[PDB]
Amino acid sequence: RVTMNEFEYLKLLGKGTFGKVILVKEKATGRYYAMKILKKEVIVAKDEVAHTLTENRVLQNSRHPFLTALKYSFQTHDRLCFVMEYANGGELFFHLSRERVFSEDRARFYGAEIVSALDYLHSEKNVVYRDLKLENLMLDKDGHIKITDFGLCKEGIKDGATMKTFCGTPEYLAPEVLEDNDYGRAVDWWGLGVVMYEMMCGRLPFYNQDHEKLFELILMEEIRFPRTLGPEAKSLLSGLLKKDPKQRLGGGSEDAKEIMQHRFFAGIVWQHVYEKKLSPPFKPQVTSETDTRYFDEEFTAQMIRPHFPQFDYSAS
């Protein structure tokens, strides 16, 4: 029963070219949410229809504590809106930009939760996420990972079943995607490698501003390892970023289970990870439900066509 009129618009949080994400209040309940607003015609025009359905079905059919829950989707004459949990601690990209590198423990913790969430998407929803990167990784008020933005998932992928779409983010693409090969859910372990690499190393494993120089580094070069990196972390990054996906950690039939058992994660209890009994190593310092201090000022300091059948959705 929901329209644009059921909410207060407070701050800008993000802005891609397809849409915007704004911090909202629900008049009727008092609660704050993050609302992703897409202009219907921009989506039709720039070809994003398929993606938008994928996000909507993947948000509705997912229940996991490190995945952004959806409360409503509803549409207007001109907009599509997702009303989702508000992740008050902002992007990882934000934190790693200020701190430069995370400690091993802190990167261990985030990697645990990420692996927990992806295991679930793979094993339970039969979905490969495809676009893991620092921007799609946020924290909630307690300092627990939330994965946001679901439009690049592949649905219906089960076991080692293969797929073709050239997509993701250039800095994060896996060799076998660059190679123009059919690929499988191990791409997500590549992406997890690149993120763990950035957390503990303070930079991307392969960098060039020019995409074709960056794609050549990806297919051709061994990764470099700062001498500050402990042997267990060296080993994990080495295995997550093996270029042949058959040889990659998590690349076999055991999937996430091969990652959980690596000595990097020794003495992390995976059940407690899921149940949220591990202590977040950074608790976001927010004064109120609407304190956007972990969002870039570039956005918060900014002042405020077909029918999609059965887009509309509602959790309770």
């Binding site: 930009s97 676009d131 990167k133 690049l152 050239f166 997509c167 993701g168 983010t169 250039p170």
Partner: peptide, 10 residues
């Protein structure tokens, strides 16, 4: 210290 990146699909 790396510029914000962009999702795409061919």
């Amino acid at each position: 210290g790396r510029p914000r990146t962009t999702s795409f699909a061919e």
